[PDB]
Amino acid sequence: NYTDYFFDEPAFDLHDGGYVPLEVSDAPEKPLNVPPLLKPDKETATDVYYTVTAEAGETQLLPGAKTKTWGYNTSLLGQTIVYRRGQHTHVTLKNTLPELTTFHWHGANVSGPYVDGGCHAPVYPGESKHIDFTLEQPATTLWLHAHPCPSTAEQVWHGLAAMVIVKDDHEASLPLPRNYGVDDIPVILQDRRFHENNQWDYRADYDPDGVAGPTAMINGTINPYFDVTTQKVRLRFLNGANRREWRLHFADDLPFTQIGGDGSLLPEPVKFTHLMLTCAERAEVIVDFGQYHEGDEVTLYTDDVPLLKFRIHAFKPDQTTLPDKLFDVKAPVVDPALPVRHVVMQGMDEGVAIDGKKFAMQRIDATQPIGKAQYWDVTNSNDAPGMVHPFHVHGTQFLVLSRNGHAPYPNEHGFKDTIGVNPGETVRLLVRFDLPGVYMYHCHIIEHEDGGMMAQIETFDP
Amino acid sequence: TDYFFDEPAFDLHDGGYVPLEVSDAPEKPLNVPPLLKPDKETATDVYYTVTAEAGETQLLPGAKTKTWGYNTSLLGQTIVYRRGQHTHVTLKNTLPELTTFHWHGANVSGPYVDGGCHAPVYPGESKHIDFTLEQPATTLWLHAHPCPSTAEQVWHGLAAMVIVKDDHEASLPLPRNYGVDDIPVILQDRRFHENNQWDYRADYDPDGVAGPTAMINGTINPYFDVTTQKVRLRFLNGANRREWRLHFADDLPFTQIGGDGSLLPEPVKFTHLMLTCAERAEVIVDFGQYHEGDEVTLYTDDVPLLKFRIHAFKPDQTTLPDKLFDVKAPVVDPALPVRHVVMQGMDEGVAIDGKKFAMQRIDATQPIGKAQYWDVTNSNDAPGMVHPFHVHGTQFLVLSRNGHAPYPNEHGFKDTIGVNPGETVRLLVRFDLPGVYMYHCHIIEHEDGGMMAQIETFDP
Ligand SMILES: [Ag+]
Ligand SMILES: [Ag+]
Ligand SMILES: [Cu+2]
Ligand SMILES: [Cu+2]
Ligand SMILES: [Cu+2]
Ligand SMILES: [Cu+2]
Ligand SMILES: [Cu+2]
Ligand SMILES: [Cu+2]
Ligand SMILES: [Cu+2]
């Protein structure tokens, strides 16, 4: 009788003092919302042009009154944005909100601070900005969300997040579900607390160690079910919550195989029955429903709470099988002239800090040359009252070398931008920035990021 | 119209104007904020702790209203500063959000002491500032200044009066007994929601937020017990947008003695006085013609704000002198261009010189100790608002309005001027200290919407 998850059972959120259990909503079960693929304004093989518009509106979530929500090219979350490697991407960023926002491309190898779209890329109500870039990184699932400093939390809670899919030649060649909306779906995992008139009140539910409500919400849907019409289904899991951790497993321990992480395909497929994700992490998995019959419903659960029902229909057999090797991880060579960087995440509540300091806009906390790989030792110092801190770094994809001198977890051998650090643990990352800019590095529990557990590094060309 | 401003441009002609309505709530004594007791005070030094905190205040019957304040649940204890005295303040933030501590109208360095956009104080942390004011006696105030949102934080209730004492003002025949005959009159409005709670974002409007319930020193339907013949009222417009058009029953006269940055050169009689956001005006009222039990109401437009209950009082036979203060105007540096500042737009198109505020961008420079002319224009006409233009880290003089005389109460030092639609005012502006100072419209929703720039001052 042990935990089924890789992380440290005592550190789990369910052990927190102000832990909010998930509760099942009485709302009607309804089809999972699959956000439309965002149609480009114009597209050639060399160039793509998109308009992305932050906007306030209303969404039917619970029965009765509609919930006031924000979203991208929609009233909640966003239309899914497809980018291609090597394709000159051109984006118009339009803000029609009553408040100034930011357009952060979490996981995008792009310049900073302006394209990156973090704390220093404000966009006022009414005005537009124009960005352009060519991603040179592997196929993966990234995402877009707001990133004012503060409050990233409030804006994400309002509903500013959208899945971003990055396509490439290698990933296209592999035998994988790719029919978006049919056998390949977003699974954006969030929670909310609904107040009177089914409205949200971030500030009423504020907690300095993380905001979480009882009602799970997947792709802006309550009590979702999904209609399976293929044997294999591809799930792109994104933890878009402000603090909650998802411990994912089917009711009957139905196996699934993870094929992707944050920043790339995994080098090899990894079989799971139980998958934990901290804030901002992604995991792409293939589920096989071949043992089931028409009419059966297999339910996906987080801990002991049902999240997502899969209604099984008729499907043609799928004989295909995954290769031993999905992707070639080309590790950089550490620059020997560089020392080891030590980053200590510390404190809790309003005490949060990185290397003894709260985030300041005008202060540069670190530098690193472009093109030069470096070992980062990252430490979560919190003691017994412990929390798994998802450490994130803008403008790169790192490799995970060790966890307390031991091997990294079996699903951490590919490229990642976010790694959960257990209380007391030091992890070692191999980090390289390709481009010049100012990039944030922070805990992706968003309430702590708004509270000062954020710092910034400047990359430069020698 | 009895007021100096342009009647067509008044707020009550605005598109989504919100008229004040009188609350059904019972009459009660005007809250007079206590004077903040120093930690330690000598003749050369003073040491304060200012704590921004969150709590609950009984404002209407039923549930309490969740508010913010400095060293209290709502607004703040009145802070006293002396010219030439080394002041030592400790800023403590116990709010669940980050904030700022701006000393509106204080000649202090920027950008840290100024406490503008660049001076964040996180939850749980403390900062330490020290300074010495070399400016005349007047009424300043303290309030939150994150960029953004100043408007949200001021709404929550973060404002407090600040009194600057000096030797000249002490020597004058003025009511000076705080809370007895020398009172704050902090003029605000609010909209009360279910369970008497405020909700800024529900009430939001890009052209300014106004609610229908007047609130004076965090009091609803206040009355004040007059126990002297003369009473000094320190008017402060702490509203987000609303203009106050002040007058008494019977058209009882009052005398303005001071404005934002100084006593007026001479006293100015009024029956009707108008104030835009962030303006302060100090007036003496005389109730010598009234008797035991008489009530005199102070109105904005047709709406009662404050009831003065006259009691028996000793006759006060003192008259004010012809001259209150000497205004020593700096001379323009002749080698220096006229600075043209244009406030444009309304709603989401608010801008200054065609640009929205960028926290990394310096829009202007000026040498310390050299007075320059500032021509400030308000472009919007037809749908027009009186824009109260404000400059950090200085006290300017008003030279002209559209090439004509300034208003009768603009011959003193000021930090905030109401500019009518289409109007160019000329200011004479000098900066004593080096720093980075914001200048902006003080209709706060425009401030937050980007009608703001920043100037940098340097030693030549
Ligand atoms: Ag904790
Ligand atoms: Ag208007
Ligand atoms: Cu992110
Ligand atoms: Cu990011
Ligand atoms: Cu970030
Ligand atoms: Cu101010
Ligand atoms: Cu100011
Ligand atoms: Cu304005
Ligand atoms: Cu200001």
Cβ–Cβ under 8 Å, residues B377 and B342: yes
Q: Which of B96, B98, B349 sits opposite A206 (nearest CB)?
A: B96
Amino acid at B420: N
Cβ–Cβ under 8 Å, residues A106 and A140: no
DSSP B371: B
User: Is the Cβ pair B360, A120 closer than 8 Å?
Assistant: yes
Residue indicated by tokens 């002491």: B113
Residue indicated by tokens 């430490």: A379
Q: Distance (Å, rounded) from C-alpha A139 to C-alpha A132?
A: 19
For residue B146, give both structure tokens: 């994150």
Q: Which domain holds residue A202?
A: 175-312
Resolution in A: 2.7
Domain boundary among A122, A147, A168: A168
On chain A, the residues whose CB falls within 8 A of the CB of B127 are none
Tell me: cis bond preceding A402? Omega within 30 of 0 counts.
Answer: no
User: Is the Cβ pair A361, B125 closer than 8 Å?
Assistant: no
Is residue B163 in a domain? yes
Is residue B332 in a domain? no
Tell me: cis bond preceding A113? Omega within 30 of 0 counts.
Answer: yes
For residue B285, give both structure tokens: 């009222």
Amino acid at A185: I
Q: Is A317 exposed, middle or buried (0-12, 13-18, 19+ CB in 10 A)?
A: exposed
Give bridge partners of residue B190 from the DSSP assignment: B213
CA nearest to B423, candidates B390, B392, B389, B451: B389
B255 and B372 part of one domain: no
Q: Distance (Å, rounded) from C-alpha A11 to C-alpha B252?
A: 70
Q: Which of B122, B347, B358 sits opposite A452 (nearest CB)?
A: B122
Cβ–Cβ under 8 Å, residues B343 and B389: yes
**Which residues, at least 6 apart from A88, have a Cβ–Cβ distance to it below 8 Å?**
A46, A47, A48, A132, A134
A291 and A351 part of one domain: no
User: Is the Cβ pair A452, B96 closer than 8 Å?
Assistant: no
Measured at the CA of B411, the angle between CA B405 and CA B412, to 5 degrees, comes to 160
Residue A449: Cβ within 10 Å count = 25
A229 and A300 part of one domain: yes
- Report CA(B458)–ligand 9 centroid distance (Å): 20
On chain B, the residues whose CB falls within 8 A of the CB of A122 are 358-359
| Shortest distance, CA B451 to any CA of chain A (angstroms) | 11
Render the burial of A52-78: b for 16+ CB within 10 Å, e for the rest: bbbbeeebebbeeeebbbbbbbbbbbb
For residue A236, give both structure tokens: 């792109």
Residue B396: Cβ within 10 Å count = 24
Is residue A332 in a domain? no
Is residue B444 in a domain? yes
Domain count, chain B: 3
- Report CA(B209)–ligand 9 centroid distance (Å): 17
Is residue A356 in a domain? yes
For residue A198, give both structure tokens: 């089914």
Q: Is B172 exposed, middle or buried (0-12, 13-18, 19+ CB in 10 A)?
A: middle
Q: Which of B97, B124, B201 sits opposite A351 (nearest CB)?
A: B124
B94 and B147 part of one domain: yes
Q: Distance (Å, rounded) from C-alpha A157 to C-alpha A255?
A: 32
A-B Cβ pairs (cutoff 8 Å, strict): 45
For residue A368, give both structure tokens: 């690193």
Is residue A121 in a domain? yes
Counting ligands in written order, the one closest to the CA of B15 is: 2
B105 and B141 part of one domain: yes
User: Is the Cβ pair A208, B123 closer than 8 Å?
Assistant: yes
Q: Distance (Å, rounded) from C-alpha B408 to C-alpha B414?
A: 13
Residue B96: Cβ within 10 Å count = 15
CA nearest to B2, candidates B303, B404, B301: B301
Helix and strand totals (H; E) in chain B: 3, 33
B274 and B202 part of one domain: yes
Q: Is A47 exposed, middle or buried (0-12, 13-18, 19+ CB in 10 A)?
A: middle
Pairing between strand B435-441 and A399-403? unpaired
Taking any CB pair shorter than 8 Å as contact, residues of chain B touching chain A are: 96-98, 118, 120, 122-125, 148-149, 194, 201, 204, 206, 347-349, 356, 358-360, 449-450
A295 and A417 part of one domain: no
A211 and A307 part of one domain: yes
User: Is the Cβ pair B124, A360 closer than 8 Å?
Assistant: no
- Report CA(B241)–ligand 9 centroid distance (Å): 14
On chain B, the residues whose CB falls within 8 A of the CB of A127 are 348, 356
Amino acid at A228: V
List the strands of the sheet with A389-393, edge to edge. Answer: A366-369, A454-460, A437-443, A389-393, A418-421
For residue A5, give both structure tokens: 């998850």
Cβ–Cβ under 8 Å, residues A134 and A87: yes
Residue indicated by tokens 């949060």: A352
Q: Which of A126, A196, A206 sits opposite B348 (nearest CB)?
A: A126
| Shortest distance, CA B121 to any CA of chain A (angstroms) | 10
Give ion ligand 8 contacts, CB < 5 A: B 387, 441, 443, 446
User: Is the Cβ pair A349, B124 closer than 8 Å?
Assistant: yes
Cβ–Cβ under 8 Å, residues B238 and B263: no
Is residue B436 in a domain? yes
Residue A338: Cβ within 10 Å count = 13
A224 and A130 part of one domain: no
Q: Is A235 exposed, middle or buried (0-12, 13-18, 19+ CB in 10 A)?
A: buried
| Shortest distance, CA B307 to any CA of chain A (angstroms) | 36
Q: Residue A10 — φ and ψ, nearest 5°?
A: -60, -25
Cβ–Cβ under 8 Å, residues A399 and A329: yes
CATH code of the domain covering residue B49? 2.60.40.420
**Which residues, at least 6 apart from A320, have a Cβ–Cβ distance to it below 8 Å?**
A175, A232
- Technique of determination: X-ray
User: Is the Cβ pair A151, B347 closer than 8 Å?
Assistant: no
**Which residues, at least 6 apart from B289, have a Cβ–Cβ distance to it below 8 Å?**
none
* CA atoms B18, B23, B29, B33: torsion sign: negative
For residue B268, give both structure tokens: 């100015």
Domain boundary among A125, A149, A168: A168
Render the burial of B244-271: b for 16+ CB within 10 Å, e for the rest: bbbbbeeebebbbbbbbbbbbebbbebe
User: Is the Cβ pair A350, B123 closer than 8 Å?
Assistant: yes
Cβ–Cβ under 8 Å, residues B436 and B394: no
Domain boundary among B170, B190, B209: B170
Cβ–Cβ under 8 Å, residues A251 and A361: no
**Which residues, at least 6 apart from B229, have a Cβ–Cβ distance to it below 8 Å?**
B286, B287, B288, B313, B314, B315, B316
Amino acid at A299: T
A77 and A27 part of one domain: yes
- Residue A449's SS3 state is helix
Q: Residue A175 — φ and ψ, nearest 5°?
A: -80, 90
A351: closest chain B residue by CA: B124
User: Is the Cβ pair A122, B358 closer than 8 Å?
Assistant: yes
- Report CA(B118)–ligand 3 centroid distance (Å): 25
B284 and B196 part of one domain: yes
Give bridge partners of residue A198 from the DSSP assignment: none
* CA atoms B259, B265, B266, B270: torsion sign: negative
Render the burial of A394-417: b for 16+ CB within 10 Å, e for the rest: bbbbbbbbebeeeebbebbbbbbb
| Shortest distance, CA A388 to any CA of chain B (angstroms) | 22
Render the burial of A104-143: b for 16+ CB within 10 Å, e for the rest: bbbbbbbbbbebbbbbbbbbbbbbebebebebebbbbbbb
For residue B342, give both structure tokens: 């244009």
User: Is the Cβ pair B449, A362 closer than 8 Å?
Assistant: no
**Residue B305 Cα distances to B157, B189, B309, angstroms:** 19, 11, 13
* CA atoms A363, A369, A372, A375: torsion sign: negative
Three-state SS across B273-332? EEECCCCEEEEEEECCCCCCCCEEEEEECCEEEEEEEECCCCCCCCCCCCCCCCCCCCCE
Is residue B165 in a domain? yes
A268 and A404 part of one domain: no
Cβ–Cβ under 8 Å, residues B89 and B48: yes
Rg of chain B on CA atoms, in Å: 21
Residue indicated by tokens 């991880």: A329
